[PDB]
Design a protein around this ligand. Structure first.
Ligand SMILES: Nc1nc2c(ncn2[C@@H]2O[C@H](COP(=O)(O)OP(=O)(O)O)[C@@H](O)[C@H]2O)c(=O)[nH]1
Ligand SMILES: [Mg+2]
Length: 655
């Protein structure tokens, strides 16, 4: 019942509103008549990996490219290859995943198969190949002509319940032959047996044509193009056939690659009997059974009721039950092998992105272990305590499913501060909270998580001598604070020596420092990358207390940071801007205006991918300015790289 050769992990992707959901639903319908939904067609298992809701979900998208094997790009046949279409395309190119295209909405007014073919050629340099011609134009669209097999199909209704293989109507008869000749030509580019025949004017075997087009599609050399109307149930069954005919099995594509703890890259091969290696890519919380953590098995076998090792951490996780999600029901399975996908129940310490392995297998990691330094802060204020109550709750819960964000209570304001990887991250989170959790609050505008730090050693003291509330308080500390190498964080060294400061308070003076670091002097942002050494001070036999030293520590640090030629530190993003050749130095000047630094340009497909360093504070509304200069065709990804000292000029302003 299992056989790689007949597995087919795909993922539908299209410009928003083009027809991804409908196309997927119609697939499940047709295959159904007998995060990752499975189904069968012509003796083949199709695992429809669920691609991110929108291309902007960059991280999610790249991960889904690695989790799927083949793709079906859906275009609105009346719009052609739109901006996002281009975006997903670049993505598909980046992960070299074979693909086929589907011209959807052929039934709609303005729908044109040639607009999709031409724009695919033009914008994407896709080298499409006409796999079929339509019958009827708009509301009169009624049939599809397979031009590889020279046969037509007409549809009795808009319900996908009356399909009839009629011969090609004389009226498109010539066009079919024209494209069939053209289709044979393309196939000859991948098979000499066919090239010979083509030249001979001979007719190659369907099995021959189908295999060469497949070879080509999987070699990233061509893109079969099919058409239809998802909503009007036309062409979907023909699309299901294309999937099996031309889309790759876990054996047709190069193996996924992973890194061992030794930093050594490795090719993980799709060997069911080899050591297990799987990726968890979507942690969902199903109503009955709790959290389903979806995984892609790359090699080896995942067994039900067993132990897998989480290399992205270091503990044995327990896979309770394994299920395959079908269109209208769940199915418990005894195991999932190489090239397959499913949802494992259990696994409480495993989060999306982690790697699970054989427990007696190499400890490879399919993804980086690094963590997204929170670079965007957004304040939230529940509106009624009742909303406040279910807010921090929704957070605790949502915090486990995704730990790439941190929450804090702003020092002075006392406000709740959610921090993420970028405006978008925070956007989906915030949204998720008002919807899934129906928590309504006032959400502040996103800002960059600046940090503060000194740039020269200082030796200061903190005294807190006061008759506070009747009794006297006395705290005296003398610390030496010096700058730590960027990224070292915090270090407290207690060099105290003669009971000079009663041990009873050492931790208390640290508590004071930790708190006065929650707000630098320049802009009241966190102080980081500093070494603090308490070496002297004094106490009052009766007047001292944990509080006096606590405050004494707070004072000492405010003093130390204000005196050490403090400097503001801003996040520096690593930006990859994929753009059409034409708008080249055009986009390069903008990034330089954003105080950027280009690191080079290495082409992708028929487009140019520019790599650069740009300060996050300069990326606000970049998505817009970009499309403003790449005439809507450009796009880009962005990641945190390092923290940097803001320029002399920049500083004087932020202050
Ligand atoms: N006329 C027509 N409408 C379609 C077709 N496919 C999808 N739609 C409609 O277009 C809208 C967006 O489609 P949907 O699949 O949700 O787009 P998605 O954002 O790509 O998932 C919905 O109103 C669909 O019913 C099609 O072939 N023809
Ligand atoms: Mg949708």
């Amino acid at each position: 019942e299992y056989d790689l050769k007949r597995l087919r992990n795909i993922g539908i992707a299209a410009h928003i509103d083009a027809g991804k959901t409908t196309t997927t639903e119609r697939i499940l319908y047709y295959t159904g008549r007998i995060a990752v939904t499975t189904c069968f067609w012509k003796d083949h298992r199709i695992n429809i990996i669920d691609t991110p809701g929108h291309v902007d979900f960059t991280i999610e998208v790249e991960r889904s490219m690695r989790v799927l094997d083949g793709a079906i790009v859906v275009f609105d046949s009346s719009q052609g290859v739109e901006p996002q279409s281009e975006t997903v395309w670049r993505q598909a190119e980046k992960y070299k995943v074979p693909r086929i295209a589907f011209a959807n909405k052929m039934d709609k007014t303005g729908a044109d198969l040639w607009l999709v073919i031409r724009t695919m050629q033009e914008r994407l340099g896709a080298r499409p190949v006409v796999m079929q011609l339509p019958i009827g134009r708009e509301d009169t669209f009624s049939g599809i002509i397979d031009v590889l097999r020279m046969k037509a199909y007409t549809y009795g209704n808009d319900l996908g319940t009356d399909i009839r293989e009629i011969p090609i109507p004389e009226e498109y008869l010539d066009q079919a032959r024209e494209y069939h000749e053209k289709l044979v030509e393309v196939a000859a580019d991948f098979d000499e047996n066919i090239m010979l025949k083509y030249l001979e004017g001979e007719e190659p075997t369907e099995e021959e044509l189908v295999a060469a087009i497949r070879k080509g599609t999987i070699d990233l050399k061509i893109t079969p193009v099919f058409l239809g109307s998802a909503l009007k149930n036309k062409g979907v069954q023909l699309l299901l056939d294309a999937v099996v005919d031309y889309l790759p099995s876990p054996l047709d594509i190069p193996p996924i690659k992973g890194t061992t703890p030794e930093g050594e890259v490795v090719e993980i091969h799709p060997d069911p009997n080899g050591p297990l290696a799987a990726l968890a890519f979507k942690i969902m919380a199903d109503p009955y059974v709790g959290r389903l953590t979806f995984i892609r098995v790359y090699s080896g076998t995942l067994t039900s009721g067993s132990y897998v090792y989480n290399t992205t951490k270091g503990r044995k996780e327990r896979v309770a039950r394994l299920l395959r999600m079908h269109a209208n029901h769940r199915e418990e399975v005894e195991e999932l092998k190489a090239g397959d996908l499913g949802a494992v129940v259990g696994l409480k310490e495993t989060i999306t992105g982690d790697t699970l392995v054989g427990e007696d297998a190499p400890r490879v990691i399919l993804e980086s272990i690094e963590v997204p330094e929170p670079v965007i802060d957004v304040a939230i204020e529940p509106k009624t305590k009742a909303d406040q109550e279910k807010l921090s709750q929704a957070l605790a819960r949502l915090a486990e499913e995704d730990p790439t964000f941190r929450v804090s209570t702003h020092p002075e304001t006392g406000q709740t501060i959610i921090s993420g990887m970028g405006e978008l991250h925070l956007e989906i989170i915030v949204d998720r909270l008002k919807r899934e959790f129906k928590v309504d609050a006032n959400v502040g505008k996103p800002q960059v998580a600046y940090r503060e730090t000194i740039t020269k050693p200082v030796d200061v003291e903190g005294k807190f001598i006061r008759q506070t509330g009747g009794r006297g308080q006395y705290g005296h500390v003398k610390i030496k604070v010096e700058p730590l190498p960027r990224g070292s964080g915090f270090e407290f060294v207690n060099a105290i020596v003669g009971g000079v400061i009663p041990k009873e308070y050492i931790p208390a003076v640290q508590k004071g420092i930790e708190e006065a670091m929650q707000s630098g002097p320049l802009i009241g942002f966190p102080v980081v990358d500093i070494k603090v050494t308490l070496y002297d001070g004094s106490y009052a036999e009766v007047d001292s207390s944990e509080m006096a030293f606590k405050i004494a520590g707070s004072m000492a640090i405010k003093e130390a940071v204000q005196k050490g030629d403090p400097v503001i530190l801003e996040p520096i993003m690593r930006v990859e801007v994929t753009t059409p050749e034409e708008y080249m130095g055009d986009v390069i000047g903008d990034l330089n205006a954003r105080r950027g630094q280009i690191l080079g340009m290495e082409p992708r497909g028929n487009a140019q991918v520019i790599r650069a360093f740009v300060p996050l504070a300069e990326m606000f509304g970049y998505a817009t300015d970009l499309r403003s200069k790449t005439q809507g065709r450009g796009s880009f990804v962005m990641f945190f790289d390092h923290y940097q000292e803001v320029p002399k000029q920049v500083q004087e302003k932020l202050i």
